[model samples]
Target chain A: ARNPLEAQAWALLEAVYDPELGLDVVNLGLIYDLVVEPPRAYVRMTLTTPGCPLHDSLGEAVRQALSRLPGVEEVEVEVTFEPPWTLARLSEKARRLLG
Target chain B: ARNPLEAQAWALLEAVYDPELGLDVVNLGLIYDLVVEPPRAYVRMTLTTPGCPLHDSLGEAVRQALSRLPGVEEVEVEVTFEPPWTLARLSEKARRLLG
Candidate 1:
């Protein structure tokens, strides 16, 4: 079976929406990487814009959301600038909404 | 890297809450399969109960959510009864909230 904790981590991650953007980080392509180990999760991510006003709030949301998962003791949110970000990565739906 | 469209599909799936249950379908683990092709997405899912009163409404919600995505020309939501449904599939938060 898939790691139950990992699945839970993913589920909790999905529940976290970017407070400013009004969209989940995963769909916004802000979630760069995620690793789930029992009692711990390491999440690498970036913001749609640099210096996002809600940086702290978004991070806290992720931490709080992951905390609700059973067996998860910690969740680390890391931000990076590698590869930058672009609208090209947006889902068709997001694009349609923007257009 | 994961499929961008597929990822968005999952995000949209998260926004769909059960009418009576009042939780996102993704966290509810109702989605069984999701295939995203540029112009089409096929989703197979199940409900928390048999003969659910909101079957049509939920299906329509799925279709509407997916249809808003770009390049998605069609979305098909198929409900199944195999293996049945259970509270065990719910996330830890859901359990705590419901309990």
Candidate 2:
């Protein structure tokens, strides 16, 4: 449905898994925004808790994973504490699993 | 319990998913290693295939994702081609999903 970076952005976003829970953030509904412009990519995301433990390293692993793609020239990631994260963001499947 | 960076490292690692596939890299066995030291984070990993379409941009997105953590001052990502990737690394759930 989109170009490689756009396509990859979606994939990359989806690829990230919550190490604690062993599930993807998308399904968990943690991601707020994913934007890709040619070689440049941007993402805004949050966690289920404000002080999630794996913050930086997980971010780095993701960066390493996505950077392997062909067209990427640069990447920028932003995590928000503004709205804070909540379980309400989880998908129906996720909620059901947790329950 | 491990330190925040280490804990976050595991969680952040879990956060990455394959968008096209909607599966976490860990279950998919995409990750090779997750190493953490104080304010720095390091990850060694691989994708499902060589020359994966999403490579570069996904890398950047990940970098950005991890960069947002509070204590993290820097991150280093490494994508490996040493062993090459295979379906064998995937978890049972992952294999079942592909089938």
Candidate 3:
């Protein structure tokens, strides 16, 4: 359910990589949702664990990456641990690369 | 000026260490303010640098440390960089130890 602009926002975020995993956030399944509101982008994301959390830095990274796109004037990244993260969230490409 | 209860609450948090500094937060000067209102504790604090921030985990450390005291029922940690941290903020003991 992506508008072309929202799709671009997702594509733009693929450049934002997770420091620990050394892979794009999209492939790592770290991004839960993204929406573009003309001049702004809203991102919902999560780290691998809350036990050793590092979202403030990672969120800044995402904001910087999204900032590069001409259409996005601002970025909002929310980090949540409620749903948690698991190996099953990895994309097929990510699994092969890690395996 | 601290009420006895507030002073005790601060003492409980002296055990919470900043991971990067390797010193108790009280001596390192990371804590900005602490207020206890009946059953809740509120903390306003800052990190050494926003360029390489790690406040989420540190905030959790503060919350856990405060939770240990019998008087505190809930903790709210707010991390800010407005005033920033400087060498001048270090305690007399901190200066002697690091030097």
Candidate 4:
């Protein structure tokens, strides 16, 4: 989050969770990169695709979550598979919760 | 493991594991389908692809596992993501182990 608007965007993103893990995307480190530019929110994230089962549904949920930001009119989410997802990607917050 | 040869083939498959999950492929239900035809073994499996960093290795590993069968000279593997992977795919035995 660069500023208050961007900060609010991440806060919104934090509300979204990966149902399979029962953990919010923020904690899960699923939200790889995020940026808010006026009416647009750009997100580049990765899904624990293998055995995750609900990428489409989850991806949509992420968009809806960010779109809820006060100043964000558009939420663009790009799901990436490059380099792949690993346990190491878990945020310290997620690790503490899981452990 | 319907017949003796078939039985042996599965036994071989059991030795292979998905390092990401640190679990055997059989229990993970990665082997969606398998069959033995004379010297040939056909395997249709799935991987958590979106974030499965080692899908290539996992795929080749399955074939290697099956190729060890006494009568299996050919091991054909198809790693499909059609239905995608889900927790329900875990076998009853896996459920017990996990639970």
Candidate 5:
């Protein structure tokens, strides 16, 4: 079973979406890792490209989403480009939509 | 037929490889747009992911590649993530390598 806080984090994040893709970032495979520690949540994710202009808004949305949770007081979204994004990262739902 | 400058640009860029991927960035499908205006060349591309730590090196490599070309006076590399990077962007070679 998933941890309660972790599950809550994902649940809250579902409300956020990538503006350009018109889909939730979670389903887009943008969210790589998420750790929920009571009042604090740290998220690691990446964009399709390096200089995505909408990242500011996207990161803000992530922060806001978690903040709305009852106990999440602080959220940190660290965007990285180590592995780089690829089509294979898309969720099954994302692939079906793209198709 | 491809323009001579455009052809040269691609040829030069082929040498710039993504450190993590161990393959040329060209084959990885990082480059989105390229315009050659005589002595000046402008390139629009993206990283595998946003906030790529190696972008400085990657961009520098791109600049150096084109600069080596004869008659190419200036090289401007602009990284943008409008449509975002995806797996579908991978070239056949990239897919084969990953596979």
Candidate 6:
């Protein structure tokens, strides 16, 4: 069995499908970092497009998903455009699906 | 005379007006922070709306504006929705204009 925290996080993220691509953001490589800090889960992530209309919805979904984890008190999903999301950020699973 | 870096940075930013409001982004309270590393200028900013289609254009304009400063080799503009921008983030100047 996988670590409960890891299992729960991945399972929750896997259920969130990109409205356009129909792929989960985890497999799409949109999630840059996920830090589990006991009662807090901090997720740093990005969108496929900077102007994506679903920005609020996606973040809200992340918050909701991680909030379901046992013992979590808060979830922070920060959307960033530091390196700027690109096709190169796509995961192997995403690439195969796209291909 | 104001600090050359400060003078230059503010002057450049003052010229960047919000397309909709016709007010400078600085006055509009869109720029969160700016850093000058001699050869690099990094700007952390946000849009009034996350889904604003002008995202790329605004970032590009910031790059172009800061790149014009002497001794700056690169400019990086990062868009973030950490606290999630709201009207409360507006400056007194912005509020007055909206009034």
Instruction: Judging by TM-score against the true structure, name the best candidate.
Output: 3
Candidate 1 chain B: minimum summed lDDT over ten consecutive residues — where? B47-56
Best by lDDT: 5
Model 3: docking quality category? incorrect
TM-score of chain B of each: 0.85, 0.75, 0.84, 0.83, 0.85, 0.83
- Candidate 5, which segments miss by more than 4 Å at Cα? A52-55, B1-99
> Which stretches in model 6 have alpha-carbon errors above 4 Å?
A1-3, A52-55, B1-26, B29-99
- Model 1, span A1-99: residue lDDT tens: 257777777778777887667767666777778877767878777656542231256666776777777776877766544546676766666566742
lDDT of 6 at A77: 78
In candidate 3, what are the lDDT values of residues A1-99, reduced to their tens digit?
Answer: 256877677787788888888888899898898877768888788776543243467778887877776777777777655477897999998888774
Q: In terms of DockQ, which candidate is stronger, 4 or 5?
A: 5
Note the DockQ of each predicted structure. 0.01, 0.02, 0.13, 0.05, 0.11, 0.06
* Positional deviation of residue A3's Cα in model 1 after best superposition, in angstroms: 57
lDDT of each: 0.70, 0.63, 0.75, 0.74, 0.75, 0.74
Ranked by TM-score, the better of candidates 3 and 5 is 3
Candidate 1: misplaced stretches above 4 Å?
A1-99, B52-55, B96-99
lDDT against true structure, model 3? 0.75
- Compose the digit string of candidate 4's lDDT tens values, residues B1-99: 467877787777778888677778888888888888868889888875443231257778888877877777787787666567887888798788763
Using alpha carbons, what is the TM-score of model 3? Answer: 0.52
- TM-scores for the candidates: 0.46, 0.43, 0.52, 0.48, 0.50, 0.51
Docking outcome class, model 4: incorrect
Residue pairs with backbone overlap in model 3: none
| Residue A16, model 6: Cα distance from true site in angstroms | 0.8
Residue B9 of model 3 has an lDDT of 75
Best by DockQ: 3
Residue B38, candidate 4: alpha-carbon lDDT: 68
